[model samples]
Target: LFPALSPAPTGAPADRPALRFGERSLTYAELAAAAGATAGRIGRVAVWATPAMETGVAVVAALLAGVAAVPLNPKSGDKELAHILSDSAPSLVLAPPDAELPPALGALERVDVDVRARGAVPEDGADDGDPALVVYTSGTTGPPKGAVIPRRALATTLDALADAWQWTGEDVLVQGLPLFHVHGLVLGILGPLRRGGSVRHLGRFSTEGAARELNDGATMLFGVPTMYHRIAETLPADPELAKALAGARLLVSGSAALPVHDHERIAAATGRRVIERYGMTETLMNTSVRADGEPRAGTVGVPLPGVELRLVPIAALDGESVGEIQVRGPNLFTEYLNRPDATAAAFTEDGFFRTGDMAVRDPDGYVRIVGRKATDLIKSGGYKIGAGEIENALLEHPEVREAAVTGEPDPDLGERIVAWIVPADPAAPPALGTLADHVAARLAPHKRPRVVRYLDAVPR
Candidate 1:
């Protein structure tokens, strides 16, 4: 089902550059051959998902072999890695010969990836429902659960994005996001490969590196808000950065919401808007601002084709109403591996996955995610408030560099608003009343922070 894994006539030219990571590079034919050689009968495999060509080749090999591939983050702690390894029960671990895996992986058989290896591309006889990947979730509530992603989800999500972004084989994507997460691995890596396009990974993100690739031949750039924030901060002194970004056809931001302030700053400097997309580990991709549509600030555009999205409780269509977002589509994961109870709790009776994310919808059908239902929803002073809007409001203040909002138990108001701020001038942080008035002016009075705490940096 994966066109990029196929060889010769159907895929890109054999000699065309398919993947690049720093000094390491691979052509389509080389990648297909290497992965083909690695492909063999196995229940599952875990790839050390470092930012390297070998990591990509390993995952592609697992897909070609019709076995699920679980990506292990290189930076994960020992306990987390141990939990995932035990949970997935992969047949072996794949990594570069030079990689030094931790003790947790010492028990499993380790196969060193050999890029020079050659073999014929395997036949595609697997069905759509066959598992292609078993990605582990962050496990904020408990231990991580493997989300079994099917071949159909991969094909459908990538094709839908091709339509939304007007992507084609002619487009070359540049990115430097981590490979463990869906945003980086799925969209940043697989999206280009599936379209028969090329990808140039920066190895590590840098404004100068991104500018160099964009100026060279890359047509699209994918990054998170932190990367764009740095770009915005650097554009004043980097004229070439502005020019490079302006020349790019598309700039996408995801993982977390892009602050409206950063969006405006980058737009003013480069004269190019950064579009945002909304998705989580469970759902490959849900919504994004279309290449042809308005690049609305603070809104995540509309749902992708074939995705059935609806707000729970059927609140008013007005932009102010907030509700949990639920979605059902081919892109949805089959289940949380080995956790039938958790999987059953994750979805509604009608089959829509409950995304615990709270959001509002514009009358025009644009989705604006507010915050997580568990952490970001603040019930205070008899009003249901979302912390995301208030945090955005706080970001507009000249003295605030970063902002996060939360609630504390209060006998009078039920829950009182608490603002955690990283100030631009730490020595002269904004006073609680000043921040309170600032938020009240932008949003409702009830949304104002009751307490303000200044810090050197806002915790992730």
Candidate 2:
């Protein structure tokens, strides 16, 4: 259970702000009371996860009540929404009073979250092994699968991060990430709460908002690459933004790799480096650039305190060996809810979860994730290539704004490397020959694009 939610026993100030979203702020006592009021009636509940104080209250309420909280994305389409609703089958849906839930959620009973409601904080009735949150994965392969995260995994991962990042109760964390995902919710919100700290959430990400929070005593900032990329783009013109970022204790980016170019850009302007961490919906946090360790660019520094990581064989023949990442740790999820076969297939006999991500390790033990095995591992002309490294190389090019690398059928090579690019200046797109040479020099001839395709923008 999170200790900061109720600080009476710990002798911490209960009046300290626990959660803040926009202008709506709640102290620890108020938040505990708000969650406690809703805790009694909950049984397996669905949270209409929004970037609002009410959404945070509802999830915290379910956790304190010792019931499973399944967070539903507000923007999900009907097809996906129906699938999640049927799969989880929660007894009720929790949302703010003003929220207009889609018809897909109409089958369930609705519970309105009132942040001002008061009640005594509930005692823990659930064991550590009990499911606390049922977070669904993006259905990139198929329909989304619910990953049952146990209470122990939550506590363990957060504690390990405390060791890795030097996170303390005195630290004030700030983020504008969505609450549905692990990086945003588990680490962003739950992390600060567990450490007896405070969190200030931006309703949505903005450079000015993040800068404002940082300037106003927020110690850390959590963001995705998209957010950081914009900061990099705007940092030159915004001296206040650069000054505010430089004063921050930590700037962490995840959910996707922050391009090396962006990292350098931000660092050069603000004199503060952005630390990158690696995790998935299944594994909460596996590796990170420790606060005490070197913040190596293009690498998720090392395995976290309790997590054990390894590189298994993946048929790489392009001089250097590339392997699939397998992890075994307390941070791992219990199962793919309802799919026993998938749950079984996701792990090795010895308990290592098969991540299906390709990566290489430096001699110093830094982990550099290449790409997914399903698509990014391109085999061409008897050589295995990772699209990620090549894409990162393309991002370094002056003319390239965004890039994606894929494999297509080739008569001679069996498969050929293809580059999908968004040029900085659409009027003068980089030619195929120019890009091919650029990539060839940055990486190698085999990893270079055999064909180039232009795009207005690369899909997220």
Candidate 3:
């Protein structure tokens, strides 16, 4: 998917810094050479490094060297690490010099790559279909599944995104999302790198650090809604910072649902519209709001080029229509590793990958997600209620900072809708009765949460 840097026009100079992490800076040529050397030694490396400059370089290096890069969360405990290690069965483990190597990884040889080091190794021409990376899902519903992404799939996504979003060599991406997540790995890093754009890794997500990167000349910003909310909240009173943010070419949000109020507030605070997109680990990204136009609230725009979206109605026992979203696209993963039955169940006989997300499309072709078919709804007293409706209604209240609605077992109701809310003021928590009243005023009685619990904070 990537053209040879030696013979092809060096759109950007080799010495130009491609990544900035703390005190370290790595140029394009330096990064490529470092990756080449790492690839030469470690055939297939399971990376468990923090979101730093070196980790990013190593990921690219693994791709360039024809090795599979399995990225694991650094914050993951022994149990999570063990599961990932067993599944990937990596030949080597790559960790930062200071990072503690898990005892489980002792069986595998360790290879260290410092971002500050610069070196080169001979290139081996690997085909596009070679396995490039394995990313694990959040596993909110069940055990995490490994999605094996090939070089061909990655290249296809990058090329399609480049064409659709107009990613150019001049773009400078400010990346702060977790590296283990598909958003950070594929869309945040690979997307920019494939376009010959530079990426600045924050190591961690801090609103202050992100603002600094923005001021330092980052043209594009990619983050989840939570990250963007923090950045918007932390932006200084300085007018120049706001002005610089307004002038940014692109600001993208994905991973989880972006609340409508949060989306509008972000644009109002920083003069750039937050373009909300939608995709999962299975598909890199299938839909995105246009960068230039009005960012439609509550909709993850139309499907991208080469992606086909179908809304299959999944009726309740009462015969109510609740659509289950199915997607067919080149970006979709071929299969889930080591789970043939599960893989087969995830798709239809006709070949559409079942997303398990329920949504309703409006007259304008904008899709407003109702809820996830599996876990994001409540069944109470023979009535099915969408959790998103209650969450959205609660979010509209000024006192409710954040809300997550889930079903809880109830004696009277089959499954009662319970809302966990983060109040703006901990000392003076909003009453559950008042919150329910607020929701009832906005939505149908069945859609309102029966029990609202005030939480100190939402669990990640």
Candidate 4:
């Protein structure tokens, strides 16, 4: 039922590589054969998604079997791991061969995936709404909730991104991200497969590793802000890396907001603006800058074709256009596993999913995410300020390596602006007054940080 891994109808290119991890590589023939072999052994199972080639094979096999694949993060603590296993209740757990089982998975029925066996690919004509994955939330408010993502979400999101990014079979993607996350697994691995493309995953992330792959043949680079930050930090020291990046077709950064400073540094060095996109666990991807368009430094461009996104204006915008972003589309997850209450609470009466993210829309329809509802919206001196704006401004300073903004209680301003900063030279941080002026001159005076705190790191 899924075209993600369907071989070419005209002539199957069995010899072409489908996936590669460092020196180890798998061809289209090998992947299909191995995945089909693994599919014959399992029904509903959980896959420990390590940064390895087998993780990709496990996921592909699960889809072929029409069995829900619960991807577990290898680094999760015992408590979180146990909770996920309990909630999903899979019949078996699949993992790479020779992997040592964690204590949390010690009691479960474990199956070691064999990449050499060949079996007929199981027929997987599962319906569009059938469960494909049981992905969990971060549990910021409570214990992590298992979100039941339907098979439709994977197809819809990838197809939508294909249109947005101009993706095709010719583009080979490279990334060094954990497979447990949507950004890594769904977009990085499955996205390529869906487009009949190939992927090269860096088993461990390194600046040199990324440069080598991108320079060699990889057309696109997928990364989070931290990875891009490292690229920006090391661009000057590595001319080859900069040259490689300049020749790349696409460079995308997401997961968390990329600071404007990092964005500018890379652009200045390589004449390439790293595109940024916006989404969450529940919604695969709603908005992203098209590869054909000018990559704006701050804004996540218009929503994808299938997604119906609207910003619900709140807190008396008066004349300004900031609002909480809500969405409804095929990309949304079906439900929270066994948590009907949470599922109901997550959506509005009219079917829009409450994103809990605040943003402002430009006159031309570009959307810039401000911050989260719980942390980034600051109420000070009768105006609503987005911490993202101030944080972006603070990052403009050459000395500021990392910046995060929050609001604390203040008698005069209702809530005072607090800036937590990591400096380029930790011994001599930027002066509070200097940072304030820097911000005030860049944005409105009220948007400037009223207080500054230096830190070794800005809490990733």
Candidate 5:
């Protein structure tokens, strides 16, 4: 959702770097001209590339050509890529130099337009409501769903965020998150692009790579909590690195719950409050906490200006108010593609999209996410326990760095709570009995994690 600015006027400051990849850089004029020229070769485009400067330009090019840009992860294997390509039926596939084109995409024509080159093409009028992009969900719980977002949705989000967060051309974003996810695509790419801000693509998240990006004068960092945790853990003692990160005007986190400890650690390390936002594939971004204020650890702050959120209580055995979250807004997806049943079931009687997430509103009107109604809680011995509560408590332990709590079958308890734990130090594993006791002290008897299983890492 870029503003229809006329290609950076004829002679503006063309020296400022618009994009930075490994050894390549594109000025604002250069990026626009490259995108214009690339647009000439593509019709309806689907870009399957890692996060690179060229990929960034390709995205803009797709938009410039009035083509629907369906971006897929380069790491996606043949089967996954084939399924997506077949479903999207794009006219062209643009990939990074290192990315391998799958057999499915081979049927379609391929183009190797380097995004760093400079040239221009005439502008084609594209409406704000045009179907510009379609992003597919991870499909962890079921078949992957495509959320068709209009150009206006992207524009609304960027405009609202830029106004609220004070993002300007002066800011630079360190792009580490995957391009396929909404956070990385919209917030990491489009958000900055709309403001004429620059983005430094690391291709992948590495502490060393992130450090280099930060040192290169990036004033903003957007990532998930896990990415921040890895960077913080790996770059603890580098004062200069921390200072450079702290100098950033904003550091945003989203896509999943940001652990309280990780939030605190990042603040202490970088001296910047990591702003946490709430969003999903259906609604790109709907809520966010302030970058300067006291970021309520577990709460995702208040709803954004254009979004309307309602928490309706689902019936609990003891009359507790756990329920599905519903959201209504300009940012909501048009519909779930090809699934009338799903589309119908996703909304409430009043027309709000049922988020399928369980939440609670505190006295201060701050919404605290309890769990996902689909698979985030279990009933045991007539007691309803929130998996997030137990997971949060387990993460409080010094030795426990990451954990996932799920329900396992058990005769005595109906469903015993199991914990898949990742220790901070792998060689010296924490005793399960001690960990159980630690959780027991903070949680109710029925809510405590009954089984603690060690793992190398927790799968997403």
Candidate 6:
């Protein structure tokens, strides 16, 4: 899947920095040598996927080795980690030798990552269909299930993205997100390598560091809503930062929706609009705002080159255009490890993976994600309301520090729209009437919150 790291791959210089984390760096030659050494170490290994270059190297090593690597989220609790370790049963764990092992991975055997080109990266891989990675889903209702991803899925998704974004080997990508998730790992680390480009990892996220890297030489910036929000917040006070950001070739946001306000803020400051994309762990990437297209706000744009997308309505449309997003392509994961029943239930009979996400497709074919199926779709007074638009509306208000909209059972309205707020000022929270008026003015009256509840914080 990665030709850049191969023995006779072209274009990449041996001395050029292929990966950088904080002050530490790795050249293309060093990475291949280190990862090649790692490739010879084990058969299915576990990686303590921290926000660092070591995690990237570890994952790359496993891939080059043709071994199935299980990425373990460092933040997961004991039970979750235990379940994952038990289910995957990796031969060993790969981690930074300098870092201390957390309680969750205390029992696992470990291998220290050394930055040197020693062992040869195995030219022979197992199979394109063979499981290269076993990424676990975020388990809301039960234990997280590992999604088996093959080499073909990675190649297909990356190549499709390359076409969609006009991404090339000349581009330099930058990101500071956790290495555990698909956004920071697959596209951030692997994407750049697959393109024969390079990636600069901000081991710890900082607006200054992000701006500095882009200012230095990085061509593209990748971020989540929180990171972009911080950039938006700090841009006003930093003219140099604004200038640096404006020089960037592209800005992409995902993982969660980048509120329209944040998108506008960055655009207003930098004269460059941020693009949004939609995807899940089960499916690497489905849709994105292409480089040639409009960087539209509130929409995830069109489907990638190889993806097949359809909107499956939750109910026969009365007024709402929203529906559950179903996707199929080579980008789809092979299965949920040790859970055949759950895996079978995740897809439709025709083979489309039913993403629990709710969305609406415009006539022009842009996909605007509303929210999740179970929580964001509210059936209130015979109307299907999408919580995303309402949430975006509420975010525009300066007093709303954080907001989440959910539906609660109600006798009178069937399901009442509930606004859970983390106020800008807890002592002087916005009144229900005020919030309703604000939302009603911005969106439809049906989308406005019926009830308001003040909370200490809105949980992530």
Q: TM-scores of all models?
A: 0.81, 0.81, 0.77, 0.80, 0.77, 0.80
- Pairs clashing in candidate 4? none
Each candidate: what lDDT? 0.83, 0.83, 0.71, 0.81, 0.71, 0.81
The segments of candidate 2 whose C-alpha lies over 4 angstroms from its true place after superposition are: 6-12, 313-320, 377-460
> Judged by TM-score relative to the true structure, which candidate is superior, 1 or 4?
1
Global fold similarity of model 1 (TM-score): 0.81
Model 5: per-residue Cα lDDT over 361-393, one tens digit each: 665556677787775446453233566656777
**lDDT tens per residue, model 6, 1-460:** 7776877333537666689887888878888888888877764789988898789889999998888889876655445567788999998899888877667677788998877647777886468898989987644344457889989899999999899889998899888877766778888999998887899988877889888989999999988777787888899999978987899988888876777888888889999988888887889899999999987899899999999988883433332588888999999999999899999999999999988888887767888887677744455543445665567678778889888888886643447889999899999999999898887765546557989999988755
- Runs in model 5 lying further than 4 Å from the true structure: 313-321, 377-460
The parts of candidate 1 lying over 4 Å away from their true place are: 8-12, 41-43, 313-316, 377-460
lDDT of 1 at 293: 90
Choose 5 or 6, whichever is better by TM-score: 6
CA shift at 272, candidate 4, in angstroms? 1.3
Q: Which pairs clash in the backbone of model 3?
A: none
Instruction: Give one digit per residue, the lDDT tens place, for model 4 in 1-460.
Output: 3354553222465666689998887777778878888988885589988899999989989988888999987765555577788888889999988988778888898888877766677766788899888877543334467778888999999999999999998899999887876888899988988887899999888889999988999999988776887888899999989988999999998766777888999999999899888888899899998998878888888898799998884434233567789999999999999999889998999999998888877766777887666644455542345676577778879989999888886643547889999998989889899998887765546567989999988855
**Cα RMSD, each candidate:** 10.4, 10.5, 10.7, 10.8, 10.7, 10.2
Which order, best to worst by TM-score?
1, 2, 4, 6, 3, 5
lDDT of 1 by residue, 21-131 (tens): 877888888888888888852438999998888888888888888888999878665556777889999889989889998888899999888787887788767789998
